[PDB]
Scaffold this active site. Sequence first.
Site, PDB file in Angstrom:
ATOM      1  CB  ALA B  33      -0.748   0.022   1.337  1.00  0.00           C
ATOM      2  CB  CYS B  34       4.083   2.139   1.633  1.00  0.00           C
ATOM      3  SG  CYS B  34       5.099   3.716   1.935  1.00  0.00           S
ATOM      4  N   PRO B  35       3.080   3.903  -1.191  1.00  0.00           N
ATOM      5  CG  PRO B  35       2.785   6.324  -1.457  1.00  0.00           C
ATOM      6  CD  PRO B  35       2.352   4.920  -0.597  1.00  0.00           C
TER       7      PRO B  35
END
Lengths: 292, 300
Positions: B33-35
């Site tokens: 999820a973390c870009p």
Amino acid sequence: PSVFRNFVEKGGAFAPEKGRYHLYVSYACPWATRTLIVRKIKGLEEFIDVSVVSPRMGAHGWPFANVDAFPGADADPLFGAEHVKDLYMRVNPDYEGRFTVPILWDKKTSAIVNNESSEIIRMFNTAFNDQLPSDKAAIDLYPEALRGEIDGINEWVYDTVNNGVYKSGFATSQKAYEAAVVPLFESLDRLEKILTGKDYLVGDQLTEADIRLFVTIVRFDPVYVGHFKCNIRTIRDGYPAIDLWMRKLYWNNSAFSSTCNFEHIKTHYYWSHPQINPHRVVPVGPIPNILP
Amino acid sequence: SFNRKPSVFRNFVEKGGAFAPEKGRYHLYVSYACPWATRTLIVRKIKGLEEFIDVSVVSPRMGAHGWPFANVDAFPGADADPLFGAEHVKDLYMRVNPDYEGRFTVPILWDKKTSAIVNNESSEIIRMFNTAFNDQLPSDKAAIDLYPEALRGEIDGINEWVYDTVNNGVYKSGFATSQKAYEAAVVPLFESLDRLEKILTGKDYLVGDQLTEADIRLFVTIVRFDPVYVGHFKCNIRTIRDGYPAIDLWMRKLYWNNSAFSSTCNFEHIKTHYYWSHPQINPHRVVPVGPIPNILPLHH
């Protein structure tokens, strides 16, 4: 489950008399905007006055312009009321219901005639015809040739669309949320194939069925997509015929443009629901509010 | 107002240094999820390092104790910590420095030999994954350079305002606690998106008609713009699908035509994290059915 369900009919306790009834509304509540739209299609601005409450609901419910002086909001001209609660507790001081808007208030009795939007637009449809001019009295948003058919479409549009957006945003669980959005967009697809090519929901003539659907669709893209998580797709770009149907009611009929204040709409939903948006931040939103 | 905090671990895997490019020496802790973590994963597959650096996928349902591992929160696609059995990412930071008062962000580049953190800054990690290991990679993967020095002026130029207004601007929009700070962030964001729209019109890449890191740093934000950032971060002036066709089409050519962008993109992990982990933006942790589909096909 609204209480007060009396009708303004000739030969009754609430007879259609000029300057006897006052309509308490908010520009943001879609059920209140129903009454106002029908109030202007038939030209009743001389039979029913309108007090617009501040859109920043909270704690004490709908406030009036004396406590919250929002642009476009009115003070209470009948009483010194600060909140809509005051009118409900005026008629019954141990009233355990809700303080729902719209309110059709009878000045002569000092009581609530009706606060159910479905009926107010329908008593605004009959009743006052004897005293209206010829053109405005000719309007009938409910002719009985297409009546039964309207209650059919109004019934599942109410359950899945008019109210479906509300069970979407106010759901407190993932299961209940999904149970509401999917029927919402499923009925929107059904509505989309209805309005393809057609200009009105039923019978080539503007009806209340268009009006009860318009007040929610007009708030779908600004509010309901982001705030109520009804974002499977937008009416702007996902439902092109539903979109176009809405904008020709808006830009070509004065009773929908003058009755539509996007400021009140977006400010109410985003500000008055702390358990959906805790910091009460109103997005810049989809620009524009509605296309030409 | 939202003020990000800079990273504390900034050492590089280079030449004859303490952190040398040795096969099977480094561990990458990320979340799908973390870009900023997705940066590392995209570059890790473009240059083919899946046999030099392994990857532990953290559960997307962040909360209370930060990023958890699959042993405490068993989300599909999440991995347990294979090196130390850690319950949360906090444990890896605290392991090396028990008086570390910073934050526990992802990505993490871990040196197995030292039992310490090499780097936790995504901008540099994608740049060490571009240098260092070239001697040990095949010719095709070692030829790739997401930062050739001819364009090292355009890349830092575009990367500087893309980070401030777009990569991080989306975060100061959604994390703002006031209307002014919110408005102070969304307006430059969409202004930079308008500027990005005129750059990528007709072009296939941001700079010099070739895949650079600047395309990768912009992709991780744009691919989740329409699913998460529009609704959750109230970045809804326009959507990339219908408002920015060249930015949209640019993104779908990286997605459907390069496996290193599709295989590193788990929309469930993305949408579940943002909506579940922020009780002060979405209190009831309800994840919308969202824009359908997650990303448009290659033909639109």
